[PDB]
Amino acid sequence: QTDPTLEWFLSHCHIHKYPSKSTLIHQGEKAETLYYIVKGSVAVLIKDEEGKEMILSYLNQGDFIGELGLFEEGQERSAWVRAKTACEVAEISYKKFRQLIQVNPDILMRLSAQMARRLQVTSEKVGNLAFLDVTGRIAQTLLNLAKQPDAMTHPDGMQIKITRQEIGQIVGCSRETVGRILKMLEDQNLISAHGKTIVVY
Amino acid sequence: VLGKPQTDPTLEWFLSHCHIHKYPSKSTLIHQGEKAETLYYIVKGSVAVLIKDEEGKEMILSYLNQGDFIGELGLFEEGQERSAWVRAKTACEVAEISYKKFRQLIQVNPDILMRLSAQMARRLQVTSEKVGNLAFLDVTGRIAQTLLNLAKQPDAMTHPDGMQIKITRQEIGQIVGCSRETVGRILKMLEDQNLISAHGKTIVVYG
Ligand SMILES: Nc1ncnc2c1ncn2[C@@H]1O[C@@H]2COP(=O)(O)O[C@H]2[C@H]1O
Ligand SMILES: Nc1ncnc2c1ncn2[C@@H]1O[C@@H]2COP(=O)(O)O[C@H]2[C@H]1O
Ligand SMILES: Nc1ncnc2c1ncn2[C@@H]1O[C@@H]2COP(=O)(O)O[C@H]2[C@H]1O
């Protein structure tokens, strides 16, 4: 939930609300502010020259955002961050945050812990993209999804609400191809798809 | 008069609490899967951080050099395992310290944590870029883009037909995550398409 250290930090921040689908951070912007999700979830994405989008990660309540430019001035935001649901996010200037670190470094410890987890997760993603064919990547994804907090249940494993587009942004493939692969998987008796709902055996 | 610190005082302080050892090229410093309880710091040399598929095909997540911390990912939560193998690329001199001791140092001077965090931030930026490239390019494009980027490094040699780089098929394979044989077939194709010239471990990237 929360504690006095986190609340001490938050009392130094201004809270802003972001409707679902609104962009909090744009790639290329000058990085001078740190964010903290008090409520809601977001998606972190990068793009290709022709507009193809790839989702690097989903982040939720309790997660810091916009932290990558904190340790060196003059850096640009490394990706776009968009609200997945309605969000309430705390924000504070890098300058003010660095001053807080000196008062109580524990706040930096908490931020660093999340960066470490993100590097582990992103590195696993590199491996999947390099060693698994699109079919195996989709297979693996239909699992990592049952890990998210928004994940639900079902007698035969668990149910999730994911679209072809969302899957494609995660594995690096068109909606069309994702559709063909999903059909093969349920043909291989691995899953059961019903609209935007899927059953993971 | 007593002299000034040969190098950064905070770094020397940190290193005085570590134990340092020498590792010959090709030696494995960190094995993927081991329980993580210690932090490393490269005093001299360079290493390769790598992962492998079920059959042993290798991919380098990153090269790390003098001044870089290693084995830091298990520091913020106990019970974790090493996320990848770390193998010496050249002869290395590496410092090691327990997470327990490092945490005590952090309490004394938070600056040492700031320094480590700065590196984790940079690694996340670089690794995220790699994810994009792997998602947006097929095997041919990954190799073509890797050659182009190598041609843009300061160590790349100017050539009358473009830029000249020196790298083996094995190293290229390790960067893109494919076999030496695959690199061979694709380099031959790129050459037939008059995009590059290959002669041994010397490649000319046409401009
Ligand atoms: N290699 C890729 N090929 C096709 N689409 C990709 C790739 N990498 C990422 N994508 C994105 O994945 C998205 C999912 O569905 P769309 O076809 O609507 O649009 C897609 C692209 O923007
Ligand atoms: N691989 C990743 N995993 C999780 N979050 C990321 C990743 N890459 C970028 N981000 C977030 O995207 C944010 C947008 O701008 P910053 O680079 O300032 O800080 C970034 C990180 O918080
Ligand atoms: N993507 C990456 N970029 C740079 N270094 C990495 C990456 N992934 C893992 N490492 C290093 O590999 C080390 C081996 O074990 P740890 O997980 O303890 O700490 C790790 C990091 O120091």
mmCIF file of C-alpha atoms in Angstrom, chain A:
data_model
loop_
_atom_site.group_PDB
_atom_site.id
_atom_site.type_symbol
_atom_site.label_atom_id
_atom_site.label_comp_id
_atom_site.label_asym_id
_atom_site.label_seq_id
_atom_site.Cartn_x
_atom_site.Cartn_y
_atom_site.Cartn_z
ATOM 1 C CA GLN A 1 0.000 0.000 0.000
ATOM 2 C CA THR A 2 2.057 2.911 1.324
ATOM 3 C CA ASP A 3 4.150 4.139 4.252
ATOM 4 C CA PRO A 4 5.424 7.348 5.909
ATOM 5 C CA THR A 5 8.499 7.495 3.668
ATOM 6 C CA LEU A 6 6.447 7.318 0.480
ATOM 7 C CA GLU A 7 3.912 9.804 1.867
ATOM 8 C CA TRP A 8 6.693 12.198 2.867
ATOM 9 C CA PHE A 9 7.852 12.035 -0.751
ATOM 10 C CA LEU A 10 4.348 12.474 -2.204
ATOM 11 C CA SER A 11 3.664 15.544 -0.028
ATOM 12 C CA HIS A 12 6.354 17.271 -2.098
ATOM 13 C CA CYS A 13 4.578 16.431 -5.367
ATOM 14 C CA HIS A 14 1.661 17.854 -7.322
ATOM 15 C CA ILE A 15 -1.005 15.364 -8.423
ATOM 16 C CA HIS A 16 -2.315 15.311 -11.994
ATOM 17 C CA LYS A 17 -5.065 13.247 -13.577
ATOM 18 C CA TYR A 18 -4.794 11.610 -16.998
ATOM 19 C CA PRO A 19 -7.816 10.144 -18.836
ATOM 20 C CA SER A 20 -7.405 6.694 -20.366
ATOM 21 C CA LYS A 21 -5.421 6.876 -23.625
ATOM 22 C CA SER A 22 -3.879 10.267 -22.830
ATOM 23 C CA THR A 23 -0.103 10.620 -23.149
ATOM 24 C CA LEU A 24 1.872 11.477 -20.012
ATOM 25 C CA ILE A 25 5.350 11.459 -21.545
ATOM 26 C CA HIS A 26 6.374 12.011 -25.186
ATOM 27 C CA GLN A 27 9.594 10.568 -26.587
ATOM 28 C CA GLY A 28 12.108 13.345 -27.236
ATOM 29 C CA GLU A 29 10.899 15.718 -24.525
ATOM 30 C CA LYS A 30 13.555 17.180 -22.243
ATOM 31 C CA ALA A 31 13.698 15.001 -19.123
ATOM 32 C CA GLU A 32 13.421 17.249 -16.057
ATOM 33 C CA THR A 33 10.606 15.637 -14.064
ATOM 34 C CA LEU A 34 9.996 12.408 -12.127
ATOM 35 C CA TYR A 35 6.564 10.727 -11.927
ATOM 36 C CA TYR A 36 4.945 8.261 -9.539
ATOM 37 C CA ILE A 37 1.684 6.415 -10.244
ATOM 38 C CA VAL A 38 -0.724 6.871 -7.339
ATOM 39 C CA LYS A 39 -3.538 5.181 -9.266
ATOM 40 C CA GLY A 40 -4.062 3.529 -12.640
ATOM 41 C CA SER A 41 -1.816 1.843 -15.198
ATOM 42 C CA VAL A 42 0.181 2.957 -18.231
ATOM 43 C CA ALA A 43 1.934 1.500 -21.274
ATOM 44 C CA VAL A 44 5.496 2.384 -22.288
ATOM 45 C CA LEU A 45 6.050 2.296 -26.049
ATOM 46 C CA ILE A 46 8.657 2.958 -28.724
ATOM 47 C CA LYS A 47 8.202 3.408 -32.475
ATOM 48 C CA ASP A 48 9.769 2.557 -35.821
ATOM 49 C CA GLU A 49 10.255 4.869 -38.834
ATOM 50 C CA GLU A 50 6.901 3.915 -40.350
ATOM 51 C CA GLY A 51 4.881 4.251 -37.153
ATOM 52 C CA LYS A 52 4.878 0.655 -35.936
ATOM 53 C CA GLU A 53 4.547 0.549 -32.145
ATOM 54 C CA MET A 54 6.225 -1.810 -29.692
ATOM 55 C CA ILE A 55 5.202 -2.020 -26.034
ATOM 56 C CA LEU A 56 8.231 -2.160 -23.731
ATOM 57 C CA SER A 57 6.190 -2.617 -20.585
ATOM 58 C CA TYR A 58 3.044 -1.893 -18.609
ATOM 59 C CA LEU A 59 3.477 -0.041 -15.307
ATOM 60 C CA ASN A 60 1.039 0.252 -12.420
ATOM 61 C CA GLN A 61 0.178 1.890 -9.104
ATOM 62 C CA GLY A 62 3.323 2.301 -7.030
ATOM 63 C CA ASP A 63 5.593 2.537 -10.077
ATOM 64 C CA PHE A 64 7.921 5.456 -10.750
ATOM 65 C CA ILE A 65 7.998 6.770 -14.351
ATOM 66 C CA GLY A 66 10.281 9.186 -16.194
ATOM 67 C CA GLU A 67 13.280 8.242 -14.063
ATOM 68 C CA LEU A 68 15.829 7.504 -16.787
ATOM 69 C CA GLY A 69 17.057 11.082 -17.200
ATOM 70 C CA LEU A 70 17.530 11.795 -13.478
ATOM 71 C CA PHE A 71 21.251 11.025 -13.182
ATOM 72 C CA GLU A 72 22.493 13.275 -15.979
ATOM 73 C CA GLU A 73 21.089 16.623 -17.129
ATOM 74 C CA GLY A 74 20.214 17.351 -20.742
ATOM 75 C CA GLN A 75 18.644 14.011 -21.628
ATOM 76 C CA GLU A 76 15.516 13.258 -23.637
ATOM 77 C CA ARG A 77 12.626 10.977 -22.714
ATOM 78 C CA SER A 78 13.421 7.488 -24.057
ATOM 79 C CA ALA A 79 9.850 6.465 -24.925
ATOM 80 C CA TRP A 80 6.192 7.507 -24.889
ATOM 81 C CA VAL A 81 4.085 6.720 -21.820
ATOM 82 C CA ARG A 82 0.330 6.542 -22.271
ATOM 83 C CA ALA A 83 -2.471 5.968 -19.772
ATOM 84 C CA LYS A 84 -4.080 2.534 -20.154
ATOM 85 C CA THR A 85 -6.820 3.422 -17.670
ATOM 86 C CA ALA A 86 -7.662 6.695 -15.927
ATOM 87 C CA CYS A 87 -4.543 7.743 -13.997
ATOM 88 C CA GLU A 88 -3.577 9.909 -11.023
ATOM 89 C CA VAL A 89 0.154 10.632 -11.147
ATOM 90 C CA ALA A 90 2.397 12.560 -8.781
ATOM 91 C CA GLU A 91 5.160 14.684 -10.288
ATOM 92 C CA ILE A 92 8.236 16.460 -8.985
ATOM 93 C CA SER A 93 11.192 18.227 -10.589
ATOM 94 C CA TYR A 94 14.462 16.295 -10.779
ATOM 95 C CA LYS A 95 16.081 19.135 -8.835
ATOM 96 C CA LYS A 96 13.668 18.820 -5.913
ATOM 97 C CA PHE A 97 13.895 15.025 -5.943
ATOM 98 C CA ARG A 98 17.703 15.066 -5.740
ATOM 99 C CA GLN A 99 17.384 17.276 -2.671
ATOM 100 C CA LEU A 100 15.036 14.698 -1.132
ATOM 101 C CA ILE A 101 17.544 11.910 -1.812
ATOM 102 C CA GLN A 102 20.089 13.712 0.366
ATOM 103 C CA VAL A 103 17.546 14.091 3.174
ATOM 104 C CA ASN A 104 16.584 10.393 3.038
ATOM 105 C CA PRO A 105 18.345 8.106 0.483
ATOM 106 C CA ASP A 106 15.766 5.381 1.131
ATOM 107 C CA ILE A 107 13.635 7.042 -1.544
ATOM 108 C CA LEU A 108 16.449 6.444 -4.043
ATOM 109 C CA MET A 109 16.722 2.821 -2.894
ATOM 110 C CA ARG A 110 13.052 2.311 -3.743
ATOM 111 C CA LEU A 111 13.488 3.860 -7.186
ATOM 112 C CA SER A 112 16.639 1.851 -7.919
ATOM 113 C CA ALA A 113 14.865 -1.396 -6.988
ATOM 114 C CA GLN A 114 12.327 -0.782 -9.739
ATOM 115 C CA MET A 115 15.022 0.058 -12.291
ATOM 116 C CA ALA A 116 16.779 -3.234 -11.483
ATOM 117 C CA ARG A 117 13.554 -5.195 -11.992
ATOM 118 C CA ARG A 118 12.957 -3.403 -15.283
ATOM 119 C CA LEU A 119 16.395 -4.310 -16.597
ATOM 120 C CA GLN A 120 15.825 -7.970 -15.729
ATOM 121 C CA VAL A 121 12.443 -7.917 -17.481
ATOM 122 C CA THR A 122 13.603 -6.008 -20.537
ATOM 123 C CA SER A 123 16.609 -8.316 -20.937
ATOM 124 C CA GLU A 124 14.291 -11.341 -20.903
ATOM 125 C CA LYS A 125 12.333 -9.585 -23.644
ATOM 126 C CA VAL A 126 15.499 -9.274 -25.742
ATOM 127 C CA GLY A 127 16.053 -13.017 -25.379
ATOM 128 C CA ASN A 128 12.499 -13.893 -26.393
ATOM 129 C CA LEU A 129 12.641 -11.701 -29.509
ATOM 130 C CA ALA A 130 16.010 -13.130 -30.495
ATOM 131 C CA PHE A 131 15.462 -16.826 -29.729
ATOM 132 C CA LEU A 132 11.743 -17.503 -30.197
ATOM 133 C CA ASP A 133 9.830 -17.517 -33.465
ATOM 134 C CA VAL A 134 6.673 -15.391 -33.524
ATOM 135 C CA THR A 135 4.555 -18.394 -32.531
ATOM 136 C CA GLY A 136 6.582 -19.088 -29.390
ATOM 137 C CA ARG A 137 6.648 -15.388 -28.527
ATOM 138 C CA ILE A 138 2.866 -15.210 -28.694
ATOM 139 C CA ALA A 139 2.726 -18.399 -26.633
ATOM 140 C CA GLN A 140 5.013 -16.934 -23.961
ATOM 141 C CA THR A 141 3.065 -13.665 -23.946
ATOM 142 C CA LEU A 142 -0.263 -15.400 -23.318
ATOM 143 C CA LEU A 143 1.350 -16.316 -19.991
ATOM 144 C CA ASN A 144 3.124 -13.154 -18.832
ATOM 145 C CA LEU A 145 -0.323 -11.575 -19.159
ATOM 146 C CA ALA A 146 -1.822 -13.861 -16.517
ATOM 147 C CA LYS A 147 0.713 -12.233 -14.189
ATOM 148 C CA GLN A 148 -0.559 -8.653 -14.433
ATOM 149 C CA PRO A 149 -2.731 -7.377 -11.547
ATOM 150 C CA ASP A 150 -5.685 -6.941 -13.907
ATOM 151 C CA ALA A 151 -5.464 -10.672 -14.614
ATOM 152 C CA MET A 152 -8.548 -12.736 -13.790
ATOM 153 C CA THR A 153 -9.361 -16.408 -13.247
ATOM 154 C CA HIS A 154 -11.188 -19.318 -14.887
ATOM 155 C CA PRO A 155 -11.546 -23.058 -14.174
ATOM 156 C CA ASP A 156 -9.235 -23.859 -17.097
ATOM 157 C CA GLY A 157 -6.350 -21.652 -15.995
ATOM 158 C CA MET A 158 -7.204 -17.959 -16.268
ATOM 159 C CA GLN A 159 -9.021 -15.515 -18.550
ATOM 160 C CA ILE A 160 -7.580 -12.353 -20.079
ATOM 161 C CA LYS A 161 -8.956 -9.555 -22.248
ATOM 162 C CA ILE A 162 -6.389 -8.911 -24.964
ATOM 163 C CA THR A 163 -6.799 -7.846 -28.591
ATOM 164 C CA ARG A 164 -4.837 -8.887 -31.679
ATOM 165 C CA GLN A 165 -3.365 -5.387 -31.822
ATOM 166 C CA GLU A 166 -2.146 -5.431 -28.222
ATOM 167 C CA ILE A 167 -0.539 -8.836 -28.738
ATOM 168 C CA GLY A 168 1.089 -7.635 -31.938
ATOM 169 C CA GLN A 169 2.577 -4.593 -30.200
ATOM 170 C CA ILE A 170 4.064 -6.900 -27.599
ATOM 171 C CA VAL A 171 5.565 -9.535 -29.924
ATOM 172 C CA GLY A 172 6.296 -7.383 -32.963
ATOM 173 C CA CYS A 173 3.732 -8.575 -35.502
ATOM 174 C CA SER A 174 0.730 -7.362 -37.522
ATOM 175 C CA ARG A 175 -2.829 -7.962 -36.316
ATOM 176 C CA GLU A 176 -3.434 -10.134 -39.376
ATOM 177 C CA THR A 177 -0.563 -12.495 -38.595
ATOM 178 C CA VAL A 178 -1.459 -12.570 -34.904
ATOM 179 C CA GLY A 179 -4.897 -13.784 -35.919
ATOM 180 C CA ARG A 180 -3.485 -16.633 -38.020
ATOM 181 C CA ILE A 181 -1.135 -17.699 -35.226
ATOM 182 C CA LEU A 182 -3.857 -17.654 -32.560
ATOM 183 C CA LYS A 183 -5.889 -19.997 -34.772
ATOM 184 C CA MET A 184 -2.956 -22.404 -34.999
ATOM 185 C CA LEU A 185 -2.536 -22.386 -31.231
ATOM 186 C CA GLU A 186 -6.167 -23.285 -30.566
ATOM 187 C CA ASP A 187 -5.800 -25.868 -33.340
ATOM 188 C CA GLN A 188 -2.827 -27.268 -31.441
ATOM 189 C CA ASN A 189 -5.274 -27.443 -28.539
ATOM 190 C CA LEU A 190 -3.275 -24.948 -26.476
ATOM 191 C CA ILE A 191 -5.855 -22.186 -26.017
ATOM 192 C CA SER A 192 -9.456 -21.138 -26.599
ATOM 193 C CA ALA A 193 -10.233 -17.702 -28.040
ATOM 194 C CA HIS A 194 -13.658 -16.058 -27.814
ATOM 195 C CA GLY A 195 -13.629 -12.562 -29.270
ATOM 196 C CA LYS A 196 -11.176 -10.493 -27.242
ATOM 197 C CA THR A 197 -11.202 -13.081 -24.461
ATOM 198 C CA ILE A 198 -8.804 -16.036 -24.388
ATOM 199 C CA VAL A 199 -8.622 -19.261 -22.379
ATOM 200 C CA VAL A 200 -5.121 -20.431 -21.451
ATOM 201 C CA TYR A 201 -5.127 -24.205 -20.931
#
